[PDB]
Amino acid sequence: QSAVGSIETIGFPGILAAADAMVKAGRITIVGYIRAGSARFTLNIRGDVQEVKTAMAAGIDAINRTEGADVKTWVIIPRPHENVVAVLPIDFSPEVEPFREAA
Amino acid sequence: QSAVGSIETIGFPGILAAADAMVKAGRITIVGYIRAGSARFTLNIRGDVQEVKTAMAAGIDAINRTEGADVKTWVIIPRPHENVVAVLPIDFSPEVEPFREAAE
Amino acid sequence: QSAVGSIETIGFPGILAAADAMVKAGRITIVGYIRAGSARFTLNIRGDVQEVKTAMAAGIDAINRTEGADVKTWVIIPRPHENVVAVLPIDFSPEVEPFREAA
Amino acid sequence: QSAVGSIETIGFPGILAAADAMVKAGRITIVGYIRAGSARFTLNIRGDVQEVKTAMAAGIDAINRTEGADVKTWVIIPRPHENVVAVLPIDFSPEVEPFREAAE
Amino acid sequence: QSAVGSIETIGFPGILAAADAMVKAGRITIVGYIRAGSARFTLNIRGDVQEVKTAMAAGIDAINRTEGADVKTWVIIPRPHENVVAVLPIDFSPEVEPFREAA
Amino acid sequence: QSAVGSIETIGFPGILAAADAMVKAGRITIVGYIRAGSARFTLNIRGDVQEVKTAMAAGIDAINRTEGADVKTWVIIPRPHENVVAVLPIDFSPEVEPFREAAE
């Protein structure tokens, strides 16, 4: 059960920047995003914990350079419990299977 | 009915941190989460009341240590009424039945 | 047409506490809850007006003891009009029929 | 087209109070409500314009007397255009046809 | 491709007033409304640009006289691009075809 | 992958103004919009990076000239990753294929 990383920002441009920087910085899979409310958006990624760590640093840096975006909150869980993956939207899916493989 | 615990924070990373810490700290089942609005998220758990208490303390501590997350509100109900379980999203489901058995 | 009681708080933990205290304090049926927006939640109950009054007092007290919850607004209508029950989500349903009977 | 009245408050208890007072005060039909966002709720009524006026005054008074509720905005349109009735949620429906006949 | 006008206010009563004033002031079609979030509502209309201009003035005046309503933002586009009409909800539909004809 | 541009404003009239100015200023395709919450709207465009840049400048100028609208945030990604296009709503669709061909 690979690590999960999650980041949230105000505004969609910021989450787009975060997502592109994250997948290019580490061997990770973007497994989903959330329209969280109040114009906040969440991005969730999976991979080896070191890859998630590097991607997260790059996603934070990308948001901070995006005009009008700000990092609100973020976390990395190295070994998420099966119950967590079953309930929260952080599991894999066929749409992202091509990018799990390369990862 | 087994006890129910509920915790709410601003932001999804905080509820993810709470969820993982809670299920690792006690013999509980995560039965659901809520996108509450205004970027707040709710997590609901079930189990024996002492296990829920231990899990809740671990969930609060996890949120406190998560950047940008704060505990907004929480509660533990030791013996929720059947009408409450039937109307509010705190009941078990097939998706979490493997974790109820392990917990139970 | 039995009385209707409605209470709203900030946060789901508060509405869970209110709902449990209300059904245990009076011979009432919880007929629904609303995700009202802005993290506010509504609970609606039905029963004899005296039972709704007692339940409401217990629901208010429960919210006030819940960490981080606050009562935003509440009302009791003793004899709601049929047009009100038809349009607003305060009618009974099969999911709650078991608890209407005992009530 | 019969007149339309619309009232909005913060919180569902307030719109419940307005709804009951309005239909009891005048020969009107409640045709719908809206979860408007930010915990605001809208109620829309129809009927003869004098009946809508009497109902609106009773709805405002009910909200004023409901704890935690305040009247945010309201309007009465005496003769709404057919294109308005067709696009906005202010038309009658089978669910309220028994109350339109009683009102009419 | 006829002009499009868009107006947004806080509260549904204001958008109802705007919509009625707009269709009565000009030879326009109301093509939709949006629950935009935060209790804001959008109204979108189409027609000859001069008709849209007159309707918009009447919709603004109607909102300003509605108790508790306020104009938040508005725009008129005289000749909207086909790509805009395809993506944004400002095109015609069967529900409003009767009122396009008269217009 | 062609470049992606994204812009966000408060209110729908502002995103309508941005959309029209953007597609008229550059060889771009509008691929979608988002009702982001809190009355904010997002517009997403695709095309060659120089065309996206020209369009973005025109979109910002349009929003600046629209009453009650302000540019809240925007970005341009020259070469978005395939996993980004597959998960976020920035890909082409049949609805806009006539405008992709004209743009391409």
Cβ separation of C69 and B82 shorter than 8 Å?
no
Element (H or E) spanning F33, and its range?
A: strand F28-37
Q: Exposed (0-12), middle (13-18) or buried (19+): which is F39, by Cβ within 10 Å? A: buried
**Which residues have a Cβ under 8 Å from the Cβ of E103 and sit 6 or more positions away?**
E27, E28, E29, E46, E47, E51
Chain E's closest residue to D42, CA to CA, is E12
Chain breaks in chain E (C to N over 2.5 A) after: none
**Which residues have a Cβ under 8 Å from the Cβ of F44 and sit 6 or more positions away?**
A12, F4, F5, F6, F30, F31, F32, F33, F34, F89, F90
Determine the distance in angstroms separating the CA of A65 from the nearest CA of chain B, rounded to an integer: 19
Mutate to test the interface with B, among A44, A73, A74 (most CBs of B within 10 A): A73
Closest to D11 in 3D by CA, of D59, D67, D56: D67
Q: Round to whole Å and give the CA distance between F84 and A21.
A: 10
Q: How many domains are there within chain E? A: 1
Cβ separation of D87 and E11 shorter than 8 Å?
no
Q: Tell me the torsion sign for CA atoms E43, E49, E51, E55.
A: positive
- The structure tokens listed for C21 are 């205290």
Q: Round to whole Å and give the CA distance between C18 and C14.
A: 6
- Chain C residues within 8 angstroms (CB to CB) of chain B: 10-17, 19-20, 23-24, 29-33, 35, 37-41, 66-69, 95-96, 98-99
Whether the CB-CB separation of D23 and C83 falls below 8 Å is answered with yes
Chain A positions in Cβ-Cβ contact with residue F37 (cut-off 8 Å): 35, 37-40
Cβ separation of F87 and A30 shorter than 8 Å?
yes
Chain A positions in Cβ-Cβ contact with residue F83 (cut-off 8 Å): 19, 23, 29-30, 96, 98-99
Burial pattern F59-79, b for ≥16 Cβ within 10 A else e, equals bbebbeebebbebbbbbbbee
Closest to D60 in 3D by CA, of F55, E68, F79, E85: E68
Q: Round to whole Å and give the CA distance between A46 and A27.
A: 9
Q: Round to whole Å and give the CA distance between C13 and B40.
A: 12
Element (H or E) spanning D99, and its range?
A: helix D97-103
Q: Round to whole Å and give the CA distance between A74 and A57.
A: 10
Whether the CB-CB separation of A17 and A10 falls below 8 Å is answered with no
Q: Round to whole Å and give the CA distance between D58 and D54.
A: 6
For residue E76, the 8-state DSSP code is E
Cβ separation of D83 and E29 shorter than 8 Å?
yes
Determine the distance in angstroms separating the CA of A6 from the nearest CA of chain F, rounded to an integer: 15
The pairing of beta strand B40-47 with beta strand B28-37: antiparallel
Provide the domain limits for residue D66: 1-104
Q: Round to whole Å and give the CA distance between A13 and F9.
A: 11
What determination technique applies here? X-ray
Chain D positions in Cβ-Cβ contact with residue C6 (cut-off 8 Å): 12-13, 16
Whether the CB-CB separation of B30 and B92 falls below 8 Å is answered with no
Quickly count: other Cβ atoms within 10 Å of residue F92's Cβ.
17
Q: Round to whole Å and give the CA distance between D59 and D76.
A: 13
Q: Round to whole Å and give the CA distance between C43 and C19.
A: 7
Closest to E28 in 3D by CA, of E77, E79, E101, E94: E101
Chain D positions in Cβ-Cβ contact with residue E97 (cut-off 8 Å): none
Query: In this complex, which of C4, C8, C88 lies closest to D33 when CB atoms are compared?
Result: C88
Q: CATH no. for residue B5?
A: 3.30.70.1710
Angle (CA) F73 F75 F80, round 5° = 145
Q: Round to whole Å and give the CA distance between E87 and A77.
A: 38
- The structure tokens listed for A40 are 């906040």
For residue D70, the 8-state DSSP code is -
Maximum Cα interatomic distance, chain D, rounded to a whole number of Å: 37
